[PDB]
Amino acid sequence: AECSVDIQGNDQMQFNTNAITVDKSCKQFTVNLSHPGNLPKNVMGHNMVLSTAADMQGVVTDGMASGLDKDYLKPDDSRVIAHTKLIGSGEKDSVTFDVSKLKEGEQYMFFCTFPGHSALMKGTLTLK
Amino acid sequence: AECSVDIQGNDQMQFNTNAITVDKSCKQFTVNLSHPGNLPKNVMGHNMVLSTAADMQGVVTDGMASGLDKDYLKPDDSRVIAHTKLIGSGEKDSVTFDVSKLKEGEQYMFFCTFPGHSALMKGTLTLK
Ligand code: NI
Ligand code: NI
């Protein structure tokens, strides 16, 4: 609870929220991702990727180009603050990261890098 | 141009038009679908499927449930007036159907049934 949050990304190409705020008291923060649905990861794969608003675009465009083998994320991309695995239906994955990696007054974005999904599957994250 | 429309499906999950006018003087109308870009069928597949605005949702839902091998279309869906195959990048397909299958004052939709795309890839077709 509190320094964790649960996200689901479904077969309708959406996330159950478009805003997460990290509380300034958290030492670490967890994002638990699940995929309700029936569709396979090769058609409707979802991951949770975090970065700044200004970088999102770069991360999606190089993610795309990497492909399904690299879970559509450029390996060791330094713009990526934290990311889960690309999961399909019935799969579950989570990531914990240092709240120290986030600074106040900066717009972060959570999104999915599977092609075309960030048009809908995106959200703001903010450290309050 | 004359009783036919050239249309494009791109890797941004966008068709290059969102309104088709079919002329009453046509015996037939031909739609010519192409897919500029680089992503394959299993990731950014596109088809042009036509039905009444009312049947669209049943076609989209059942299409999803038909699977990738079925080109995400319920085969012999009684509601589909015409459709192309689901094409990936570099590919192309056309469909010619008779104009008598359309009537005056019905609302028709064209759309793509690939998972999550029709919220974005959709337009109106109209008999004038
Ligand atoms: Ni996704
Ligand atoms: Ni499509």
Curated annotation (Swiss-Prot), chains A, B:
CDD domains: Azurin. Transfers electrons from cytochrome c551 to cytochrome oxidase. This is Azurin. InterPro entries: Azurin (IPR014068), BlueCu_1 (IPR000923), BlueCu_1_BS (IPR028871), Cu-binding_ET (IPR050845), Cupredoxin (IPR008972). GO terms for molecular function: copper ion binding; electron transfer activity; identical protein binding; transition metal ion binding; zinc ion binding. The gene is azu. Disulfide bonds join 3-26. GO terms for cellular component: periplasmic space; plasma membrane. Cu cation binds at residues 46, 112, 117, 121. Pfam families: Copper-bind. It is found in: Periplasm. Residues 1-128 form the Plastocyanin-like domain. Keywords: Copper, Disulfide bond, Electron transport, Metal-binding, Periplasm, Signal, Transport. It comes from the Bacteria. NCBIfam families: azurin.
